[PDB]
Design a protein around this ligand. Structure first.
Ligand code: A1AIS
Ligand code: A1AIS
Ligand code: P5S
Ligand code: P5S
Ligand code: P5S
Ligand code: P5S
Ligand code: LBN
Ligand code: LBN
Ligand code: LBN
Ligand code: LBN
Ligand code: 6OU
Ligand code: 6OU
Ligand code: CA
Ligand code: CA
Lengths: 389, 389
């Protein structure tokens, strides 16, 4: 009856259960109350709204379809490896990921003019958007740390927290920064400098974020998780502390990617993990350059903020499927993350037939082959340093 | 730890498990194989299709979104009370129901011209569709049994099979046929006769379908379900019989709606069941009359064929939630069925402001009140006949 253990491990990694429930009204379902709310809200909107403007009806209908799909997600979609701060938030994150996957599926069938029209419908200002370090100055160097460098620091902090490896994080950091420098040489869009991508991105933002993530990860590993109930706390300070720590992990998994005597499927799964990581880093660059929008546009940072949100559970589910011998099935969030990464790659290839010439396409392919080979060399070096030191 | 029993009963009525699996390759998941298939098919379509015609791109993208949402349904959506012939078919039925619910949500925000344009886009021929029994003849009476009378017979057979009650079925049959006769008097659209709805619909089609459904239900109750494996059958005839009986119920539930000493929530839940039944019968009539399409159009019989498909699990889940004391949550298919019924009612009210005048609206409201009162009287009479005879 090992199939019992297999399906229970799949439910452990796919729909985690809330343990030691003390305040029971956060976890008792009220789906008939939700049905009445749904029907009454849709009734109020149907019978009171003004449906005279035909382009507002479409926008409101889209927003309402998204909202009630999130409701359906809360009701029916899987929860993931996380139960904190509430499993319903992760059900809604999964529903958003499914919506994005279906949006990419639909996008793969239009032509470029239809996609540009679909974009100008969202932000009409996107119609007019278009695509020196010899005078070195400390002021201009320090002026590089904008809000996006802050976001990049924190994204690398989250990545290092989840991955728990200096080697993988630094490998991906250096390889992607060099790839981006190469692409900015191939495309005249570059404006900042060499030194930015060489020092102020690898060493300071990415490196510091990785350091912070690894420190916080070691802290969360070495600590004891004794959760008292909010009802049992008698001080107000303890109540506020418990309510704010409800937004932190209840427990922490010990993550080791390479064992001393590792198999071949293990190293191959780690290599595929690093390759999909590089691919998701390429998707951002190429979506930004194909459909011309800036980094400050809600498309850019919205997609970048959603990809990290769905990256958090995906790493845990991938690590479980890779290492846990009894997890005989891939989590559904990891499945959707993989399909979203590959569909974004296909979208960039389909509508990206204008970016490069044939010689530039040759150079891009040769560089991507060299990057895959260098990633493999770094992975082998990590395996060797592990199984010897 | 009664919450364990509560959630296990919810999983019994919401995601039923396949028992005694002998041919294991119909039930082992292959979601990475499905991921590779998804990506390769979408890649082949993206890189080979002709995206020159802009109105074919939208149609193909819609169809592909539906297909891959059905894939996501197979992966993530609940199964229902049924595991026969395969739980994935019922996951896909649930996904279609979710799609229809979201379509109604979207429809509630457009105006009437936008809905008519959305319809003429589907079937351009819908632009030109527009809204004697004193010479009695046996030939004209027998000529009434078209393919739709056949479908109605079989729909009532399925309803009687699931409900397991002559009283409820005959009550709904007579009340709805009288309501439809009243509405066809209020609307000059009538063409057939009095005698059709009085004799050839209540007595022959509905009555005969109910009789057949009750006979088949008693048969399925009194029989023993010994399922041998397809591998263990040694004759070819037995193999074909097992393969064709894989499309029949594996077991049958004994259904009794009224106990001798029933509560008030029990009778109230049965009354609500009958009222939602009447409402779903009204939705068909009014969708057909608001948006003018014939009964032979794929909209009419397609929606009528999908509503029965999702009616099959909904009745079982409603009966479980009503009668089973440990089923502390409503099944998700029953939830979606209820929201679809009420949303179709809201859609008919929103776009149906043209069908009736104010006096006709008064007559419709008075008739619906009388119908609710007569349904309650019939339910009380059934309760009395049960608790006395
Ligand atoms: C503060 C929160 C108030 C209460 C929250 C309670 C809750 O969060 O419960 C979630 C349940 C299902 O999850 P849950 O029962 O835990 O697990 C299910 C699992 O059994 C399935 O097998 C699996 O497939 C999975 O998808 C799950 O559906 O949904 C609901 O009731 C939400 C309606 C609340 C709305 C109340 C009024 C709103 C309008 C006014
Ligand atoms: C003849 C059929 C071949 C094999 C069928 C196997 C199967 O039907 O399995 C279904 C599983 C998940 O169900 P299942 O594991 O039974 O139950 C899950 C439950 O554990 C969850 O908790 C719950 O949330 C629920 O939604 C379920 O997802 O999906 C799949 O693998 C389908 C991919 C097959 C495609 C194979 C190649 C296609 C391209 C070529
Ligand atoms: C909607 C989402 C908003 C936050 C969700 C949320 O507050 O979780 C609700 C929590 C309930 O904690 P508990 O019953 O003591 O145990 C939970 C389980 N043992 C755990 O530690 O995971 O509630 C709390 O303990 C803290 C209440 C803060 C509510 C802030 C909103
Ligand atoms: C635009 C759309 C974007 C939508 C995306 C939003 C999702 C944001 C997610 C990013 C948070 C990154 C935090 C890193 C992280 O992994 O912690 C996530 C924690 C998970 O708690 P857990 O159940 O105890 O996990 C135990 C498991 N064994 C483990 O090892 O970890 O759970 C947490 O503590 C995270 C709390 C974040 C606060 C969310 C508030 C939202 C309310 C509205
Ligand atoms: C895709 C859906 C197509 C039909 C699904 C289907 O054929 O079910 C697969 C069945 C497998 O039966 P089993 O392993 O003996 O036991 C099942 C369980 N014990 C039950 O009786 O429910 O397979 C069979 O037993 C009959 C095979 C016919 C396949 C026709 C297609
Ligand atoms: C346009 C879109 C429309 C899509 C809708 C399609 C759904 C059709 C459903 C209507 C079938 C009505 C049959 C009546 C019925 O209820 O039997 C349904 C059976 C269920 O089997 P089970 O798991 O053993 O149920 C045991 C449970 N305890 C019970 O008492 O019943 O399961 C069955 O036996 C039904 C088999 C029907 C054949 C389906 C083939 C589809 C393949 C493609
Ligand atoms: C033109 C340019 C040219 C460029 C050329 C480039 C060429 C480079 C090409 C490289 C191709 C390399 C192929 C190697 C494949 C071998 C894999 C393997 O066997 O390991 C297996 C698992 O492997 C898996 O887990 C697969 C699951 C993945 C599906 C989800 C995707 C989501 C990813 C999310 C990533 C998120 C990252 C985001 C981080 C921010 C190991 O497991 P097992 O031992 O087999 O046993 C099964 C598991 N149990 C039983 C133990 C439980
Ligand atoms: C203008 C014209 C005017 C007209 C006026 C008209 C006015 C008429 C208005 C009539 C309104 C009557 C209201 C009566 C409500 C009382 C209900 C009650 O208490 O019973 C309760 C359940 O009740 C429920 O189950 C509710 C769940 C329903 C939600 C899903 C909808 C899907 C329906 C699918 C129908 C499919 C049919 C399709 C068939 C083909 C009983 O249960 P409980 O004892 O409370 O305990 C809970 C359950 N446990 C604990 C035992 C497990
Ligand atoms: C190309 C790989 C196709 C081979 C395949 O998937 O069969 C699988 C390879 O299984 C493996 O050994 C892992 C390697 C697959 C990782 C590649 C996914 C990326 C797809 C992007 C390609 C774009 C170009 C065979 O295993 P499975 O049983 O079919 O799947 C396991 C499913 N459960 C059991 C986990 C549910
Ligand atoms: C109006 C009824 C609203 C009252 C309500 O739903 O609270 C519920 C009435 O619960 C009942 O007693 C059943 C009666 C409700 C049937 C009406 C549904 C049709 C909605 C169409 C209205 C259109 C006009 C209270 O119970 P609940 O805990 O909130 O829900 C139970 C949820 N689980 C436990 C089953 C998951
Ligand atoms: C939810 C958790 C997800 C957090 C991941 C953040 C992603 C990091 C990121 O990509 O940075 C930027 C993302 O932008 C943001 O998310 C801004 C939000 C700042 C605070 C975020 C956390 C608090 C993208 O800008 P860029 O042009 O790519 O510049 C990067 C190097 N020049
Ligand atoms: C899947 C199982 C669902 C089967 C339910 C069928 C619904 C029955 C029905 O409504 O009949 C008709 C449905 O049409 C059909 O489904 C035709 C299919 C015939 C065979 C169906 C079963 C085999 C609707 O026509 P109408 O104009 O409403 O006439 C009715 C009285 N004049
Ligand atoms: Ca950079
Ligand atoms: Ca009729």
């Amino acid at each position: 009856k090992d199939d019992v253990n297999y399906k229970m491990h799949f439910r452990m990694i796919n729909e985690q259960q809330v343990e030691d429930i003390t305040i029971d009204f956060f976890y008792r379902p009220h789906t008939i109350t939700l049905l009445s709310f749904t029907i009454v809200s849709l009734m109020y909107f149907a019978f009171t709204r003004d449906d005279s403007v035909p382009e507002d009806n479409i926008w409101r209908g889209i927003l309402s379809v998204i909202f009630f799909f999130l409701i359906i997600s809360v009701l029916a979609f899987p929860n993931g490896p996380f139960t904190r701060p509430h499993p319903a938030l992760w059900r809604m994150v999964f529903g958003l990921s499914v919506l994005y996957f279906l949006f990419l599926v639909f996008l793969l069938f239009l032509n470029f003019e239809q996609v540009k029209s679909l974009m100008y419908w969202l932000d009409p200002n996107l119609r007019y958007a278009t695509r020196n370090c010899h005078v070195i100055t400390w002021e201009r160097i320090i002026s590089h740390f904008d809000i996006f460098a802050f976001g990049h620091f924190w994204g690398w902090a989250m990545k290092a927290l989840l991955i728990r490896s200096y080697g993988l994080c630094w490998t991906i950091s250096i390889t992607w920064e060099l790839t981006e420098l190469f692409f900015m040489h191939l495309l005249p869009n570059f404006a900042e400098c060499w030194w930015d991508q060489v020092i102020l991105d690898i060493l300071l933002c990415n490196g510091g974020g990785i350091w912070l993530g690894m420190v916080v990860c070691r802290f969360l590993e070495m600590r004891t998780y004794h959760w008292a109930s909010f009802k049992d706390i008698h001080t107000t300070t303890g109540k506020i502390k418990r309510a704010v720590l409800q937004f932190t992990p209840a427990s922490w998994t010990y993550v080791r990617w390479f064992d001393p005597k590792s198999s071949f499927q293990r190293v191959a799964g780690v290599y595929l993990f690093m390759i999909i990581w590089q691919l998701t880093e390429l998707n951002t660059f190429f979506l930004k350059h194909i459909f011309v929008f800036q980094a400050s546009h809600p498309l850019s940072w919205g997609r970048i903020l959603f990809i990290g949100g769905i990256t958090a559970p995906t790493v845990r589910q991938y690590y479980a499927y890779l290492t846990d011998t009894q997890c005989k099935r891939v989590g559904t969030q990891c499945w959707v993350f993989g399909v979203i990464g590959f569909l974004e790659a296909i979208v960039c290839i389909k509508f990206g037939q204008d970016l490069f010439s044939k010689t530039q396409i040759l150079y891009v392919v040769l560089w991507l082959l060299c990057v895959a080979f260098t990633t493999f060399l770094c992975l082998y070096g990590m395996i060797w340093y592990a199984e010897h030191y």
